[PDB]
Amino acid sequence: AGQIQVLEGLEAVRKRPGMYIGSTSERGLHHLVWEIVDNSIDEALAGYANQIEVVIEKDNWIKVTDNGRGIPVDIQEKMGRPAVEVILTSSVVNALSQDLEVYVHRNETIYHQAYKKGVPQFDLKEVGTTDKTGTVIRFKADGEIFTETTVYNYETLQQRIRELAFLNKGIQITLRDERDEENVREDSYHYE
Ligand SMILES: [Cl-]
Ligand SMILES: [Mg+2]
């Protein structure tokens, strides 16, 4: 019943995306980033992260990295699935992304899963080792949902990231635009 309910959730969000994120215009596109960044900020506020990096990658992928605990990977009694899988298959960003990847650094291990329109492409995999903790999320907004534009606006991201760092003092939040490899722009904010 758990994973059927997952599938129905994805269908619901993709059918009425604007009920979930406000709009499917440029505003809703940028709201994807806010949803993810907000979750990292909660992890900082909980006491466990202090650095968040947002990268606009080639072809308008977004990568958000935090140095928090890493999303848990333990098997849920609820779903019979790893915790990270439950969390990401119930994410609006994931449902509304053509593709999304997560890398978790936790338990001295790097774990990876990928998704399309919220559907996992393979089971969560151990792919390496690590001496850090945190989470990396990379996603590509689905152009079938965001029919006006899937191109992010650096200045829009910059303005809100600046505001978020100012509001959440102590968190280092970095924005980087790598879309043009010949001219990479970065702004990093860190208030007291
Ligand atoms: Cl875990
Ligand atoms: Mg939260």
Q: Where are the domains of the chain?
A: 1-192
CA atoms of 70 and 174, how far apart (whole Å): 19
Whether 40 contacts 66, CB under 8 Å: yes
Helix axes 26-45, 154-167, angle to 10 degrees: 30
Strands 172-177 and 51-57: parallel
CA angle 88, 99, 107 (to 5 degrees): 45
Tokens of 121: 């492409």
> Cα separation of 169 and 52, whole Å?
13
Cα–Cα distance between 16 and 186 in angstroms, integer? 35
Which of 164, 183, 152, 182 shows the shortest CA–CA distance to 174? 164
In contact, 71 and 102? CB cutoff 8 Å: yes
* Resolution given for this structure, in angstroms: 1.6
Q: Ligand 1 center to residue 152 CA distance, Å?
A: 33
Preceding-residue numbers of gaps in the chain (C–N over 2.5 Å) = none
- CATH number among 1.10.630.10, 3.30.565.10, 3.90.850.10, 3.30.70.1150, domain 1-192: 3.30.565.10
List the one residue out of 85, 76, 143, 74 whose CA is nearest residue 115: 85
Compute the distance from residue 102 Cα to the ligand 1 centre, in Å: 14
How many angstroms separate the alpha carbon of residue 82 from the centre of ligand 1? 9
- What residues have CB less than 8 Å from 165, skipping those under 6 apart? 171, 172, 173, 189, 190, 191
* Ligand 2 geometric centre to CA of 40 (Å): 8
Residue 36 CA, ligand 2 centroid: distance in Å: 9
The identity of residue 88, as a single letter, is: L
CA distance 159 to 187: 10
Q: How was this structure determined?
A: X-ray
Name residue, tokens 């848990």. Answer: 72
The answer to whether 30 touches 151, Cβ cutoff 8 Å, is no
Give distance in angstroms: CA of 121 to centre of ligand 1: 21
Ligand 1: centre distance to CA 38 (Å): 21
